[PDB]
Design a protein around this nucleic acid. Structure first.
Length: 140
DNA sequence: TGACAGCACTGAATGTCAAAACAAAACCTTCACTCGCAACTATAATGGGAGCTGTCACGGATGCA
DNA sequence: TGCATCCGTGAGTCGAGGGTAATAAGTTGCGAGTGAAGGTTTTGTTTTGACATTCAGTGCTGTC
């Protein structure tokens, strides 16, 4: 529960300690990352909500993945490949320039569901200019 | 020369009179049932101690006799 | 004038481990009190006339 500028300042740790707990027992490095944001309103007065953020490990070439959590089936329907070049501090303004601008300036209405993030940890000191997709479930 | 400072006034955009509705549970009816009282039953029956408690110890006491 | 009897008294501060267990009749009648929660009532968050300003708006007005 944080600010507009803290829409990715808080979100940096929710992928990292989730990754480095599993990397202590991972013989590989899974190179496709998945993050899921959720908007769920209330029932008492319809002015409030809460957000449960789920980063996940990919069902990839390593079959045995003993990770705490849930087997999450990704939502189907229309999506958008918002590929990017920039560091996780640059997805801070990239999430804000897709959601402050690219939903008005491309005039699109994102649909109900989990906003799929597609980071790339395959290029994980210099500041890393990573590549990432923001696969929004869209209703065009 | 062009900035550079300040004025003229629209008006959309505020700050007030009203309701408009929605869940809030809050207090409140309800209405069927679960959960409780009370009475009777007719061959014959008739007297506890329920286990208990066993010698400390000098001392003062009151009332019987 | 003794002789029995009947009450009422008895270290200090600690300590441990911890409350235990008989037996007995039912059907039938039938009012009273959780209770299903049925459903209202309130006690608060939202629409619309206003018009009085206000700054926003755009341009001019005047100026270094």
């Amino acid at each position: 529960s944080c600010s507009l500028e803290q829409i990715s300042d808080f979100r940096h740790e929710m992928r990292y300690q989730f990754w480095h707990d599993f990397l202590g027992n991972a013989p590989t490095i899974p190179p496709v990352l998945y993050g899921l944001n959720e908007t769920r309103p209330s029932q008492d007065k319809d002015d409030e909500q809460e957000v449960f953020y789920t980063t996940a490990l990919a069902q990839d070439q390593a079959d045995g993945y003993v990770l705490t959590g849930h087997p999450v089936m990704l939502q189907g329907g229309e999506y958008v490949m918002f590929t990017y070049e920039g560091l996780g501090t640059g997805v801070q303004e990239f999430i804000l320039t897709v959601y402050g601008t690219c939903m008005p300036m491309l005039n699109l209405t994102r649909r109900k569901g989990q906003d799929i993030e597609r980071y790339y940890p395959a290029e994980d000191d210099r500041p890393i200019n990573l590549r990432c997709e923001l696969l929004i479930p869209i209703r065009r």
